[PDB]
Design a protein around this ligand. Structure first.
Ligand SMILES: COC(=O)c1cc(C)cc(O)c1C(=O)c1c(O)cccc1O
Lengths: 140, 140
């Protein structure tokens, strides 16, 4: 894997792209083959490709305003090219305040300048429930 | 400063082995006497467990799940920070049907590096929080 300081720079940019709460900014640090997989595996939530995320995050980020990201724990394994972030998110929607918490497992690419794989344990009800309901709305 | 990386890694290995062994004394041998456990997410408000609390828990729990298996999916070790994360999948048989769980478990080592000092654990907490205390009503 890449040197620790190269990986660490990517890890920091990943976090600031998330905190920036824009689709292009967040995806800037994905590799081209990067995927996101919701945990636990038992929930059977389909993998998200980079393209899936480009289509999904504009509406999702528009729904949640005043987004703030609290980084509670960062664990960086430079010899393995891996990291974990525990993050707490807060936002507003018309349905009131919004909160989530994420245990996000990251793999860096070999060059070390991108995130190549994400596995994420979080409250997935929005992508599990509310999103089959948009598929049918644009279907209608 | 943190313990030697090599010792932390060995403690991580032993912690996993004590978990897999599915006995109270075997698993808690790798917890410091002051070790605490915190169920994640924080929004669930589950009170911190002391080591003593956990010593009362694990006996009847481990007694109720048979053929316990522990599969280690991901280990992320930050030796400079004296921390690690494990992603693990567990299964067991119970008289009510099969048990499955998955755990994103954040660990901190003690100064010598031969014990885990602090645990924060994202997992399905329903059995511990809902099923086990229905047996607290039984005792009384
Ligand atoms: C627009 O979403 C993101 O930027 C996002 C970002 C990261 C690092 C993890 C996520 O899980 C999400 C997300 O998908 C999401 C969601 O699906 C529902 C609510 C809040 C969220 O942050």
């Amino acid at each position: 894997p890449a040197p620790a300081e190269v990986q660490a720079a990517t890890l920091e940019k990943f976090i600031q792209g998330w905190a920036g709460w824009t689709p292009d900014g967040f995806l800037a640090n994905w590799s081209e083959d990067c995927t996101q997989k919701t945990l636990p595996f038992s929930s059977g939530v389909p993998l998200r490709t980079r393209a899936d995320t480009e289509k999904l995050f504009p509406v999702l980020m528009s729904l949640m305003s005043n987004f703030t990201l609290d980084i509670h724990n960062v664990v960086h394994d430079a010899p393995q090219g891996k990291a974990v972030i525990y993050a707490l998110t807060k936002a507003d929607t018309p349905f009131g305040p919004y909160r989530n918490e994420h245990a996000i497992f990251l793999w860096f690419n070999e060059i070390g300048d991108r995130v190549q794989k994400i596995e994420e344990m979080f409250d997935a009800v929005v992508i599990q429930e509310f999103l089959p309901k948009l598929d049918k709305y644009v279907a209608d």
